[model samples]
Target chain A: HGGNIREPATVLGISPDQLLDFSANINPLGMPVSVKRALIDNLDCIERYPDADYFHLHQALARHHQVPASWILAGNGETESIFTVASGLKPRRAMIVTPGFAEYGRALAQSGCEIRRWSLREADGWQLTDAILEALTPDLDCLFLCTPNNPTGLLPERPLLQAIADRCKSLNINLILDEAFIDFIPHETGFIPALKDNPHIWVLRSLTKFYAIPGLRLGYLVNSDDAAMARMRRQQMPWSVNALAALAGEVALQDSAWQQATWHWLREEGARFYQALCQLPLLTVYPGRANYLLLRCEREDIDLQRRLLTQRILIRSCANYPGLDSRYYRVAIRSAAQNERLLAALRNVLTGIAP
Target chain B: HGGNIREPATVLGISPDQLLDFSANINPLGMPVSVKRALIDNLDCIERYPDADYFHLHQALARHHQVPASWILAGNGETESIFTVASGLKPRRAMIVTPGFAEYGRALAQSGCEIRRWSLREADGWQLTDAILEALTPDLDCLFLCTPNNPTGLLPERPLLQAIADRCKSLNINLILDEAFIDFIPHETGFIPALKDNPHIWVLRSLTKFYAIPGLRLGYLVNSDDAAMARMRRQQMPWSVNALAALAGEVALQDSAWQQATWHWLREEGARFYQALCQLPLLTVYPGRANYLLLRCEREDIDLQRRLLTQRILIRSCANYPGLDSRYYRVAIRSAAQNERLLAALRNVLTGIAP
Candidate 1:
């Protein structure tokens, strides 16, 4: 829902290509050259049905992550993994971190699971604290936690995450640890490695966001529990990952050069952009680990999103996100030039002055 | 599961590309040239997320089928449509045509629904008849009927289909009419036009088999019942159709020339292939309307699939299909040259002499 440029574009009476979209947190580097070439070369693949088990695709992901192939389940996107887990588990009561990705709650709801929202306080800068461990009570059948979380874009400390995992295991709660944007966090390995020892925890990874192929829709879930994996796989529809997406994932995972380049770009540009946003008046920008920043406007009366639309700029208004209001906004970190354009637009909209 | 060339190829120690796969009933003509060009030109589309609502894709399909855009709900594939209906309806008891598509039962089973199989007898040439209307009981919450049904390749007569729809409506059963291969039936317009009045009927269509892009995974469900459509839409994962698939669908629908050519090929080649198969000894060929044929081997001991694999050919073994045994096989109607190769292989395998 975040990357829906069409609806806004239709209202603006212009083509989707006309808008500079900062709504969805996708890679600024775009799809890798290798993946593009692979897709172009494998055009004939569309004539045949995709490999049902997605053997090669899973093998590639397993090798990349250094996990057993049996532990991996590739999905159309992280969204599929989310829904599959929720439906398969049939959790009676689920707890989701409020202001996180909306799909987690939606998926749980589809399974007739009652949702308990654990609200992240703005006073603590929307960070996941040790208090979350106490909230992981015995009554909850499932808990969804996002690392480098959506909307707020904050990563909980590793020790705290490990404590929460331990608490969930003790409480026998199914923990769905979503590290969808972990690839964007420089030097941050996220929670995938912990999946081997934590049989109760399912780590969800999105290849689309980091690899810049959201349109192709590739993501995966990793867990060591064979029984749970089997149930989830059984719940998944056949050929869920389209051929191009599977092939793209196989090719994209092999592009180590692209991964390194992305990290370098993010470390340099992310810092510069964050500093620039800090310089802007009446804006409180959260130093997020992922490729997006969560911002709050000091003046609550400003219709920031509508004002930006006049400049053909589209930023996510976090009003619809649980625990967020119209004052909260999220913007993805694009290339230097695109970031500068966003900054300039913000300045013009807020201060009535051109930078 | 039919077009799984990779598994057999792996067993044979060859690349999937080396095998002439007839197991999958894809259009032998392959992916349309226009679709390939559109995919190549729109390679950049993979960089961004697909349009969530898929507005233009729905508009294109609505225009092609002459249906209201609101009546259509696009999915990753027809598999998704099947699973969505099953999950959304949450039917307690459902009846599926045996030796039909396996996914229907699998999907219903996931929803904790008890299944009642309506078996099709081989003595009846695996054809669905009016007797099925008697099986439409009020105890059943749903019924899955496939036209030009998979493996059997026989479409239930149109009048019978209408009667079945009327029965389902009166019984308050959700009817999922699968027309996955209906496009291949020459001079036969399937039940899509009847959807306006038949609110209980949900028509499933696959753009894959006809357009030969199963690898991209594009299909949709059409229904006149706004409430049912909304529920199914709610059950669907967002952006299930990838951008390339959506784009391919839009372009493929515009190519009426491809449709005409395919019809011509199927008419000439399908008839010839059926006649040749009939001439072969120890084979009972069902005269199916679609682009594939169902053949039962008279010699029960023969492992036809294994024999064909010896020649690096792959055909579907319907042994796993409900009500089908090891003696049954299904093959696609390929180009003249490929059909000749299959014929030659069958002659050699059956008679111990190459024709």
Candidate 2:
């Protein structure tokens, strides 16, 4: 939680500065220096309305991703892109893969789409199997899926994702994949490799989580369907992305070092954090392919979290999620010192200490 | 344009790099150093979502205009704020003071509000009047008024605005004042004077104009009423303000010297540009209180705009506005050199000289 940490941190009985949040899986390293520099350079730009075309920006992102610029449409954030995708296609009946980001459901619901969620099973480490394809009814006009599904950090197998993509294409359905946190997964697994080749595939990505700039609200969608994209962009609040956020994104995507450092840190810290967490007597942390850990506590009272909060440590209580409760908690694998502090606090709490 | 100045000397029919751009009103001073420095210092912030509450920003802005911090809500830009207001109070039926900025009409239309526009009379120089309040009926839920109205920058007397505010309050109607160009108006002539005492007024101020940070997308809404402001913030997309934009806004507002500098520049440049425009034979330039001068031609042609575009000059053709037509055009008051070049082009076009 940087300076603009939005969630009611103090309401939880802890200052944001004191809380080690595992709720949002943002880049543990924080906002990049290069991006910050670019933003500072362009601060005065706020006085001017953003470029009507965003021509230069699309080109920069296009070159970085090796995709044609025409395939991209930027939004205020990944959430906004999801809504735009739903609105543009006006999907009458949409299928969402669940135990995922809650915003997806809210966005689609707001768009008046009849939602059908395919719940991921706990036995499968919350992973999606090809069995999800069974629910791809032809009448469904849109599909929303989040890879390395939030909360669980479980990535659907490639074959499982391709099956859904294929079915959507065959039925002329819009397939929207939100990869807001996919950057944490090695090589970004499960991004329907062949999806972009089809105009029906909508890929939503945000530099926020990966760059630790959730406060900046920048995200984009890639779809080869020009007419669909045009309608979606037009429907959005114009100039939705601030000029500085746009500037920062164009630079952040090109910061090869920031990208590499993120992956490197996640590898070392994520593994260490997972190992230390497994050592806890009352915690059962599953192996994750992403930057955060998903755990199920032996105690449903959330006594462990409550005790830790006394020490000023805060973690996401997954009770608000559809199938989870206080027994389920998520922790982000942050820097070494932060991880150690979390581990020590857990050790104290598990021993039935007040911490 | 600072990146590469186009010399005014005609090179292959190109008179100069300066074009008469009325598409948007940007401060002649461009982005100030303070805003630029803020972006550079906070670029790393782009990696996060913007401050959920925008504390420092709201604090600074609240202090700037002596409004309570609770009264202000920052946005991506003034444009988004307009949509947010509509999304709330849907304002079933509304009156738009026309020959105004086109955004309010578009926003009202999208909100499903049946719009009834009360256009400005050429006979009155397009000034708003207390008479508009008389046009208000019980069926009308809202009224959108622009002061120093675009295309015809005529500001109404303070008492007239005060009377309208009182009438709207008595009638229980919402009045959205789009003051995008208010800062450019010289002297103490602004409806903002009535803000502290008027709870029915909603004022939108854009940093994109006078701040010259259009790219930054900074703007704020002020209200003395807490419930309405709370409703507005809740209906808004979370993290609607970017981190860098927030920081930039915070610093820019505190730089009173910068504001004074911009004010001084406007006073000198606005009048100089006005005088130069008056010399054009076919153009009837009006004395305006803001940075843009509206010109009414003797006879209607292809919109002095399309003709200007043939010379690569993009003057705003006012035909699309509610009241103005092909005979009307709007031009931004630019720097001395740019003003001279625009004047020279006018002479060539007015005299019908080939070269």
Candidate 3:
């Protein structure tokens, strides 16, 4: 939930090489073959500065999203885009749906914005609803919505998200929609299409999640408001994205073959993985359309995550996500073999324990 | 000044592949082979997030700089370090020594600081004197000093820099010293050793310039004020430095053989290049200790940079530097063959334009 995976490796007294990490929802296929070759090919040019205008990178992203080049602003990651938007916008007050990605809150707090949380109900599967409009008062300058939000892995229905966007636009409020994990859903993901007519809506997307190059750190922001986007671009530190990352984004965005393969893999593996978790007597799976599944333990004292860690399996313990308690956990859907490994570990842990 | 080298290439109707760029000061030796090897080796690891704490990278830099690991905060580049410090400190009023790097001013302005310039005089060889203390008014919160100042290629003598640091300390003003170009000097080029006790002084160092990996974007900040450094670290976006960049930094820092070779090259080639420029009848070469030299044309009417670009050589036109005019230019001390090419081009251009 806090965007760290290394600490768990240390806490478990194991090297990352020996651990099975499902804590982060990155694509299990690793980086595309083309992106790796692009990186190696561009090693000779690392001596020069990145194209400060990011001319080619912006073109590649624009082509992928079918958006104007002016609408996209590349960043180090979605984190930098979040911080840049927060600082540049200088919003007096903002709200983010929780439990959600904590980066939005961190960025907002740094800008001295008073934050309000439209806390989603766990009983409602942590899905935001139309009722959130009541919390979107006229005084708020912006709202952060993370679709397929971290930890909970629940995305609001398309119509619900559209209604929220409409309400915010009419209220003269900026909507910062983070679709960092939505690429896993294949379709019914992203709000960039709505961005052309809705200038108030900003979409933040991460190439790191579906492209699976999180360590390379590439993400970008899209907004129809040219002036505001220009302001955000100005606030961005020059060369925030590395040359290799720029190349990775360019290559990954064009790898439609890898994209199609991933879409199919997620649709199949994701559902089967969810069903396996639900079959467990002790786990209450929160249905999600994303590549990861969230669960709540039937017994609060079991310490399920710690038990899994001892077995060299790591799952995200969502105690840190606001409104989610220690019993909550999230796990990425990996290859069928690894999924079965985790499920078997669960069976061993649960069945071996007293009824 | 435009921060884009490719822009000039387009205007001249030439590809960047054909242009020799000395506009941005970067190492001439190319990126270290060790760094390249490390980058290729670590390509698979890009599928995950970089260690948010950057444990190993920090350890490598700390070992190289001989400072405590806690004193170092790696950044995407020196630009990010400068911006992070400016925003985190929120200094009400700050002064940058004019005819300096433009980035410091850009960063401070974004933080809503009233900016003042401790303008260095061209007539006095663009050097800083102890007399600059007179402008250190009580209202100023910080002062920026780019040692071996960009564009002008002038660095204050060690005693003079120490005097300014002491004065700023006594006045309770923070001193932000940027040593981005200092590594080229080999000696008498840094103030980091004095940083342990000088809590108010922040030293910004760039691995990109010396390591020749600017496109990779790696730099670090060194400060003795632990609390202040912690605050700045908090303001930094997560994984701002990409995985390849972090890996490049770790490998480059430990390549002592490459470092030794560069020092030898700079000491020999740098001197020969400087003397050759000094011999040019139509140029006034400014004395500099680093691997780059600054020159002023004898005739104000000469557009040396534009003329040289027609011959496929690009030199930094210092017209955008606050205290420098169009007649001023900067060029890196490249390899013997490349330096000879530039000198030959200058000879032809100067003699051909005159009687």
TM-score of chain B of 3: 0.97
Q: Tell me the lDDT of model 1 at A22.
A: 89
Interface RMSD of 3: 1.5
lDDT score at residue A320, model 2, on the 0-100 scale: 75
Top DockQ model: 1
Candidate number with the higher lDDT (1 or 3): 1
Residue A172's C-alpha lDDT in candidate 3? 91
How do all the candidates rank in terms of lDDT, highest first? 1, 3, 2
lDDT at position A260, candidate 1: 80
- On residues B1-355, what C-alpha lDDT tens digit does candidate 1 reach at each position? 7888889899999998899988888887788898999999989999988888889899999999899999999989888888888877899999999889888888887789999999998878788878888878999998998887887888887788888888888999988889999888877777778888888888899998999999999999999998878888888899899999999999999998987788899889888998998988788888888888888988888899999999999999998888999999999889899999999999877774332
Poorest 10 consecutive residues of model 3 chain B by lDDT?
A: B346-355
Better of 2 and 3 by DockQ: 3
Inter-residue clash pairs, candidate 3: none
Worst lDDT window (10 residues) for model 1 chain A?
A: A346-355
Model 1 ranges with Cα > 4 A deviation:
A352-355, B352-355
Ranking the candidates on DockQ from highest down gives: 1, 3, 2
Among all windows of 10 consecutive residues in model 3 chain A, the one with the lowest summed lDDT is A1-10
Q: Please state the Cα-based DockQ of model 1 relative to the true two-chain complex.
A: 0.88
Q: Which lDDT value does model 2 have at B342?
A: 72
